[PDB]
Amino acid sequence: NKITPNLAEFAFSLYRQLAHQSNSTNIFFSPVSIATAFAMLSLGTKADTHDEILEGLNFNLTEIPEAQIHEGFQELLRTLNQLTTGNGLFLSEGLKLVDKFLEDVKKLYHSEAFTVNFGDTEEAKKQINDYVEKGTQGKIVDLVKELDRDTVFALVNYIFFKCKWERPFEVKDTEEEDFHVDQVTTVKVPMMKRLGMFNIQHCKKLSSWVLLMKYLGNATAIFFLPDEGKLQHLENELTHDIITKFLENEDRRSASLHLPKLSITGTYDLKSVLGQLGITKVFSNGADLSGVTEEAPLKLSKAVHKAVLTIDEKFLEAIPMSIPPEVKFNKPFVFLMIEQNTKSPLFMGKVVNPTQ
């Protein structure tokens, strides 16, 4: 797991940017799928264009060799393959493509590349969206809304995750509860609750409750419920070592946990978003994509990421007679999904309003 620290720092730089944009919308994205997509894309780039991408993924190219970077990602794909994800490359049908790139995309990163007639904008937009919808079986519809006029290369990265808890909730105990969108305003949401033994603890550094729940597939969801007026403090203080320390501890205590059902999405323009992380040339006219096509000019004019999450109710636990704490996730909270093997950040998000 040599590239795990870089993924974690890429997750945070990506999160802190989205949280800076707007603080009133739900955030949810996959650092792993985005970084894998652009690490794979780098195989067809050279020189500054190539360096901007790996550096943009938080890889110090003067310290870690690229062989380890791609080896780390491919070793992560072997682990990762209910999680449905896909990355589609759509290239203009008039381009002479380099076989090496198409091999690397299919063999090494297990991704898909298609040739499109970008002369028909509406039909290109349809084939792109039909591909996503077919890969998510209708969960993600009409992803791409528009295409630039000079579009000759589009990238689409989708991921849909349905969480199956190790310790499930009982549907009969789910009912409507207030969700405090702020200190004086509430909104009713469906709220799951269970009295049991949880990996839960209040953290002084983070000023937050920290809940860890395993789900089926050797991965763990970490929820950070900040104290009153501590959301910004929580987001600033999060580090990979703090997260790793929590994964190490397995001690449980009793609590009456209230956790809302979640059906949230995140749709992001990777050209805009990754542009503020330093990845700009691959989207510009001076892009060195000579590993993709050898003679014609090429640039990535479209890159979209959509991530969809479903949290619901989806072994006997002995509960002491002491008064259990009441931990309600009824206000904005931060969360991550961590793969247990590689410790890599599968997903990261913030719920400002489950009903949004």
Numbering used by the authors: 24 to 104, 111 to 343, 352 to 393
Text lifted from the article:
Mutants of alpha‐1‐antitrypsin cause the protein to self‐associate and form ordered aggregates (‘polymers’) that are retained within hepatocytes, resulting in a predisposition to the development of liver disease. The associated reduction in secretion, and for some mutants, impairment of function, leads to a failure to protect lung tissue against proteases released during the inflammatory response and an increased risk of emphysema. We report here a novel deficiency mutation (Gly192Cys), that we name the Sydney variant, identified in a patient in heterozygosity with the Z allele (Glu342Lys).
X‐ray crystallography provided two crystal structures of the Gly192Cys variant, revealing perturbation within the ‘breach’ region with Cys192 in two different orientations: in one structure it faces towards the hydrophobic core while in the second it is solvent‐exposed. This orientational heterogeneity was confirmed by PEGylation. Cellular analysis revealed that the novel variant was mostly retained as insoluble polymers within the endoplasmic reticulum. The variant showed a 40% reduction in inhibitory activity and a reduced stability as assessed by thermal unfolding experiments. Polymerisation involves adoption of an aggregation‐prone intermediate and paradoxically the energy barrier for transition to this state was increased by 16% for the Gly192Cys variant with respect to the wild‐type protein. However, with activation to the intermediate state, polymerisation occurred at a 3.8‐fold faster rate overall.
